[PDB]
Design a protein around this ligand. Structure first.
Ligand SMILES: Cc1cn([C@H]2C[C@H](O)[C@@H](COP(=O)(O)OP(=O)(O)OP(=O)(O)OP(=O)(O)OP(=O)(O)OC[C@H]3O[C@@H](n4cnc5c(N)ncnc54)[C@H](O)[C@@H]3O)O2)c(=O)[nH]c1=O
Length: 210
């Protein structure tokens, strides 16, 4: 009974540390066959798209249009979904993703301002009814996420955005999470141990209810 779990949040939200907790939890619950995926990326094509999308001046001085941005995130996503994720799930292997469609809804929807209706029809046109079985949205303030991204190194094209861009993106993450009960909003502005605990119980409960 394979499942697709996705972790979401701004850069700097600590999604890898969150995945470590998710893995430990699942393992303690006897769930051990799983593979990881990260978006944008995960296949030769997705990795090339990832570079065009994030590398500073990937296309010189030309500015990538918001819609071209949206469509490349979707090209990378569907490539990954169809050639990696689905087959893994069809094989009984669980899949834990670092970002998925919610990222597009929050960043291109909230941060860029692309119409939600449009994003919805794109998602349906491209992915149909495929959705993650559980999503863990790690909520962190924009200032803390950015501080962490900068401490890490050079900022990608999107992370170089304004505070207002991240502010809008965060809000839309919450807004979308509020309308889907399978998307849990985890308070990640709390100390690490508190965060890790929230994740562990949420996951444990969801699995028990499986
Ligand atoms: C899929 C998609 C993405 N995007 C945007 C989202 C992004 O802005 C950008 C690049 O996306 P990317 O995720 O590949 O970029 P990454 O560099 O991988 O960023 P992540 O989103 O994976 O960051 P995380 O914060 O989860 O990663 P983690 O490795 O856990 O931590 C990042 C750094 O923060 C520190 N950190 C983490 N937690 C910390 C804590 N509690 N205290 C202190 N520091 C902490 C870590 O030490 C590390 O340096 O693309 C869209 O616009 N639309 C889409 O559809």
């Amino acid at each position: 009974r394979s499942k697709y779990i996705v972790i979401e949040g701004l850069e700097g939200a600590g999604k890898t540390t969150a995945r470590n907790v998710v893995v430990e939890t699942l393992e303690q619950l006897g769930i051990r066959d799983m593979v990881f995926t990260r978006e944008p990326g995960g296949t030769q094509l997705a990795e090339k798209l990832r570079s065009l999308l994030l590398d500073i001046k990937s296309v010189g001085d030309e500015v990538i249009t918001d819609k071209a941005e949206v469509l490349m995130f979707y090209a990378a996503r569907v490539q990954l979904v169809e050639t990696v994720i689905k087959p893994a799930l069809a094989n009984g292997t669980w899949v834990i993703g670092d970002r998925h469609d919610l990222s597009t809804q929050a960043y291109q929807g909230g941060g860029r301002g692309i119409d939600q209706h449009m994003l919805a029809t794109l998602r349906d046109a491209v992915l149909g009814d495929f959705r993650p079985d559980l999503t863990l949205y790690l909520d962190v303030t924009p200032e803390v996420g950015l501080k962490r991204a900068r401490a890490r190194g050079e900022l990608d094209r999107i992370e170089q955005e304004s505070f207002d861009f991240f502010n809008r993106t965060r809000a839309r993450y919450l807004e979308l999470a509020a309308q889907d009960k399978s998307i849990h909003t985890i308070d990640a502005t709390q100390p690490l141990e508190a965060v890790m605990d929230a994740i562990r119980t949420t996951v444990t409960h969801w699995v028990k209810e499986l």
